[PDB]
């Protein structure tokens, strides 16, 4: 009987990355707002 550990590691890392994508998407609009205000100050 083989080991499930490599397959589990890959799937866990992949879906942890999906979670990172979701949570980063929650914050991206306000990063954009910060960049817009930076560009205002830099005009």
């Amino acid at each position: 009987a083989s080991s499930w550990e490599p397959l589990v590691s890959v799937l866990e890392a992949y879906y942890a990355g999906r979670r990172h994508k979701k949570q980063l998407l929650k914050k991206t609009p306000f990063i954009i707002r910060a960049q817009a205000h930076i560009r205002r100050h830099l005009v």
Binding site: S2, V8, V10
Partner: protein
């Protein structure tokens, strides 16, 4: 966005342009690559984007994620029908995993088994995962 660059951006948790430690391996595994223990031991302390893109480009040149993942799944294809048991995968994900909550596991299992066949085509699943 391209998968490797996005993986770097997603696992740079400090946002310092560097991936380090466990995250490094995680980033690699997030692209469907299972590095050998020798490759893991040889990894540097940390990687900036040029380092990571070079490592992944040289790895993928000799390692096809789709075929290696389908090959790993086929080891548990008892019926040899292109399928693996959904509850077996669920239990092993919950027993050996370290990052995923139970709801995330359950969501994945419904993904791979949309009709609730108790089986997983894994080939179709790995494909519709690696896009």
């Amino acid at each position: 966005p391209p998968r490797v660059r996005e993986a770097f951006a997603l696992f740079d948790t400090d946002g310092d342009g560097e991936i380090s430690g466990r995250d490094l391996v995680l980033a690699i595994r997030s692209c469907g690559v299972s590095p050998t223990p020798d490759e893991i031991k040889a990894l540097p302390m940390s990687m900036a984007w040029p380092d990571f893109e070079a490592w992944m480009s040289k790895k993928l040149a000799s390692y096809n994620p789709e075929e290696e993942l389908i090959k790993s799944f086929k080891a548990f294809d008892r019926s040899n029908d292109g399928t693996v048991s959904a509850d077996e995968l669920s239990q092993v994900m919950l027993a050996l995993g370290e990052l995923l909550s139970d709801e995330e596991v359950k969501a994945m299992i419904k993904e791979a088994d949309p009709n609730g066949t108790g089986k997983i085509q894994y080939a179709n699943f790995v494909k519709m995962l690696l896009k």
